[PDB]
Design an enzyme around this catalytic site. Structure first.
Site, PDB file in Angstrom:
ATOM      1  CG  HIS A  47      -0.539   0.335   2.521  1.00 46.23           C
ATOM      2  ND1 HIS A  47      -0.479  -0.831   3.363  1.00 46.23           N
ATOM      3  CD2 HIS A  47      -0.118   1.238   3.091  1.00 46.23           C
ATOM      4  CE1 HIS A  47       0.089  -0.096   4.549  1.00 46.23           C
ATOM      5  NE2 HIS A  47       0.185   0.877   4.362  1.00 46.23           N
ATOM      6  CG  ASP A  77      -0.454  -4.167   2.589  1.00 43.57           C
ATOM      7  OD1 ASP A  77      -0.087  -3.647   1.457  1.00 43.57           O
ATOM      8  OD2 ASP A  77      -0.536  -3.339   3.542  1.00 43.57           O
ATOM      9  CB  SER A 143       2.841   1.553   6.444  1.00 40.26           C
ATOM     10  OG  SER A 143       1.419   1.373   7.077  1.00 40.26           O
ATOM     11  CB  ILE A 195      -9.848 -24.777  -5.454  1.00 44.84           C
ATOM     12  CG1 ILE A 195      -9.910 -26.264  -5.790  1.00 44.84           C
ATOM     13  CG2 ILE A 195     -11.105 -24.550  -4.230  1.00 44.84           C
ATOM     14  CD1 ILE A 195      -8.638 -26.427  -6.279  1.00 44.84           C
ATOM     15  N   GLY A 196     -11.859 -22.859  -7.411  1.00 45.22           N
ATOM     16  CA  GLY A 196     -12.990 -21.931  -7.513  1.00 45.22           C
ATOM     17  C   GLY A 196     -14.035 -22.116  -6.479  1.00 45.22           C
TER      18      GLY A 196
END
Lengths: 272, 272, 272
Positions: A47, A77, A143, A195-196
Site C-alpha cells: 500500500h 500487503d 507502514s 480452487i474456484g
C-alpha cells in the site's frame, strides 16, 4: 547506576530502516522500509508503493536512491524493492527467535514524515488472523518499517494501526515476511493454488465459473470431505491448504453428493 | 525475583515537579513546572502562564505558593517562575547525560488536573527542528513538566503532543532549557540578534522596513554570500547564526548585486 | 545478550484471565475477568455483566463455561462470577506487594474481541479518588481484566479509560477488589452503612426523607461536629466513615443547632 536504554537496539537496527516515498505527477504517499539483504533488497508494504511512478528510498545516513519494484503481494500487503547494493546496513535477523507475548519491542519508521522515529511497546498477541499485535505506537508513515526486539533483531514488518483505539497495531512476522520476500525475488509474485470455491465438511455456497471446481465436476450444495487426503472441515484451514499446492498439480478431493461418496480429481491453477 | 520498576526515578524527580495554575478574574488554564534551583526558580511553558493575573504553584508535599514571573520566551515557549526558596526539592540534572534514542523516559505533570501523573515511553527522536520526541503519553496539563530518565535526571521540559496521532509528543531538551532559563534570570528576556530579512546563497524575498538590512544598503532580489565571515547558504542555519550575534554588534556581510561583490557592514539590533 | 521480556509475567498470569461475554435474546457486550480462587470465583466489572441473561466465560486454554452471578457492587463497579472449579489456573496475588508509581505493569484483557491482548505501561498514580492510574493501553473489552506487575502479581482490575486523551486508564487495586469479592461471596452484596444526608463541620444541604438523619432529629442548616466520636469536617472522609458502620448500629453524633451542642443518637441502616 546507568539509565535504562534500548539505544543499542536502535544503533543495530535503525540504520537499515529507510524512508520510502511514492511519487507521481510530487509525493503521493510515504512510508518506511527495511533493508533485508546487502544486495539491496528492501521490504515495505504494498500500500505504500501502489501506483508509484517513481520510488525513492532515503537512508538515515542521508543517501537517497531510486528503487526498482521486484514484486508485491496483495494478500500479505508486502512489496520488495531493490536499490544499488553499495555498503548497505542490513537488519539483524535471528531465524531462531520466536516472538513471545511480552517481549519488549521498538517500532522504527517515518510517521507523518517527521523523520525516523522509534516507539516502544511489547508484543501484545501473536497468531492474530499471521500477524503480531503490538502497542508500540504506529501512525500513518510507519507502514513498511521494522518492529525489533531489544537486541535489534527483526520481529516483523509494521503494517497498520486498528472512541479511538489506543495501542493496537499490527506487524507481519519475520518468518512470513521473509518467505514472501524470497518468493517475490524468485518468481516476481507469490504463486498460490486456487480452487474456484466460496464455502462456510464445507458447503459450496458458490462455485467460481471458469473455476477448477466447476470445470472438475463440483456443483453448489455439495459437502467436500477430504482435500488431497486431508479432512476438510474448516474453510480458512482448507483455503490455506489449497493455497499451498503448486499450480498444474492434480489432486484428489472427496465430496458428498446426496448421500454418496465420489472422489474427484481437480487440477490446481494459480490464484489471480 | 523483584518487580521491574522506575519508582526510584519517580522518588528522585517527582517532588520537584509542580502543578502550575494560571488564574484571572478562577482558573484560566493549568499545567506543570520543574524546580530547577533551590533558590526557587521554576521552568514552565510560556503558554501555561500567558495572561495570568496570578500564578499559583502547588508542590506534591502540599505546599501552595504564589509565583512571580522572572521572564518568558515566545520562541522556545519557556518561562521562569520564582517562588520562596525554603527547603525546596530540586530536579536532578546531569550536564553530561546526552539523551539517546531508545532511552526509557518518564513524563511527570498534571494532565487534566487529575493530580501528578507519571507516564512512560522512550526518547523517539532528537534534533526535531531543538526538541526531543517521545512516546511517553503527554496530555493537556503536562506542558511545563519534566521528562526524566530512569535515574531521575532531567532530559527535557514537556511542551506539546502532535486519525488521531498516538505517542508523538515533544520536549525542549535540558541543555537548551537551562540556557534559556539562565538568560531569563540574568536579562529578563532572551536577547537575540536581528536582521530585517525574509529569505529562501539566500534570496531576500522581503526586506524588513526599519530593518538593519534595508537601513544598511541591502535590497530585494540580492543574494547574500557570507554572513560575518561564514558562507550563507541555508536560511535556518543563517537565521540561527544572526540570532547569536549580540545587538549593537557591527558585522561584515557579503552580497551579490547583479554580478558584483559588495561587502556590507550591517549593525545587529535586538529581535522583538 | 537476551531480549528484554515480560513473557514470564504473561505465562504466570494470562492463563487466569478470561474472556467474559454478556448474552441476551446474542452478545450484548463483552469484557474480561480474573480467576481469583481455585474454587471458581472470578472478578469482573459490573458494567460488563449488567442485564445479562447468560454469562459465558472463555478461558485461554479453550474451555468455555457458563457462569453464575455471585453478586455485584455498583459503587466499585465490581462483580463476582462463579464457574465449575476443575483444574483452574489462579491469578498470582501477593498481599504484601504495594503498587508503587513507576512499577511496570501489563494489562491483560479482550479489547474489541480481538482475543486476549497484553499491553504494557506503568503505574502512573495511586489513590485516584481508590484507583490505580496506568498508561498500559486499555480499550473497550479490557474492563474486568488484570493489571499485573512483571512478576505476574495482580495489581488491580482494569475498569475504564479516561483532543483524545492518551494513556490514562484506571484499575481498582487488588486489596480493595479482593475485600469487595469476599463480601460478595459472603453476603451476596456489599453492606454499607447509610445516613440520610447530603452535605458540603458539614452543612446538611438536604436531609433524606425516611433517612435515619431526619427520623433521628436532624434537620437542614445544621452543622454536624462529631460522627461517632470523630470530628466531621470533610464529606468524603465522613461518608467513608458512615459507610463502615454496620447497619442496626446505634452511634452517637454531635450537631450544632443555632449556637448550642446537642448529641444525637442515630441508628445506622443499610444503603440501597
Amino acid at each position: 547506576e546507568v539509565p535504562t536504554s534500548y539505544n543499542q537496539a536502535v544503533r543495530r537496527a535503525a540504520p537499515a530502516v529507510v524512508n520510502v516515498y511514492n511519487r507521481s505527477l510530487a509525493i503521493r504517499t510515504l512510508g518506511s522500509g527495511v533493508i533485508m539483504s546487502d544486495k539491496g533488497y528492501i521490504l515495505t508494504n504494498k500500500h505504500v508503493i501502489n501506483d508509484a511512478e517513481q520510488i525513492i528510498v532515503a537512508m538515515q545516513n542521508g543517501r537517497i536512491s531510486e528503487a526498482l519494484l521486484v514484486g508485491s503481494d496483495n494478500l500479505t500487503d508486502l512489496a520488495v524493492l531493490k536499490i544499488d547494493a553499495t555498503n548497505l546496513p542490513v537488519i539483524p535477523i535471528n531465524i531462531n527467535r520466536t516472538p513471545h507475548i511480552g517481549d519488549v519491542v521498538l517500532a522504527i519508521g517515518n510517521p507523518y514524515n517527521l523523520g525516523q522515529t522509534v516507539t516502544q511497546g511489547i508484543i501484545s498477541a501473536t497468531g492474530r488472523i499471521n500477524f503480531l499485535q503490538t502497542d508500540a505506537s504506529i501512525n500513518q508513515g510507519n507502514s513498511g518499517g521494522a518492529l525489533v526486539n531489544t537486541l535489534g533483531e527483526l520481529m516483523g514488518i509494521n503494517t497498520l494501526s486498528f472512541e479511538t483505539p489506543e495501542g493496537i497495531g499490527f506487524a507481519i512476522p519475520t518468518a512470513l515476511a521473509t518467505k514472501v520476500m524470497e518468493k517475490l525475488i524468485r518468481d516476481g509474485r507469490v504463486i498460490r493454488g486456487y480452487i474456484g470455491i466460496t464455502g462456510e465438511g464445507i458447503k459450496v455456497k458458490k462455485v467460481s465459473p471458469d473455476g477448477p471446481a466447476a470445470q472438475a465436476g463440483i456443483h453448489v450444495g455439495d459437502i467436500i470431505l477430504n482435500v488431497n487426503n486431508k479432512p476438510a472441515t474448516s474453510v480458512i484451514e482448507t483455503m490455506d491448504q489449497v493455497a499451498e499446492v503448486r499450480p498444474g498439480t492434480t489432486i484428489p478431493v472427496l465430496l458428498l453428493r446426496n448421500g454418496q461418496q465420489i472422489a474427484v480429481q481437480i487440477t490446481i491453477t494459480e490464484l489471480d
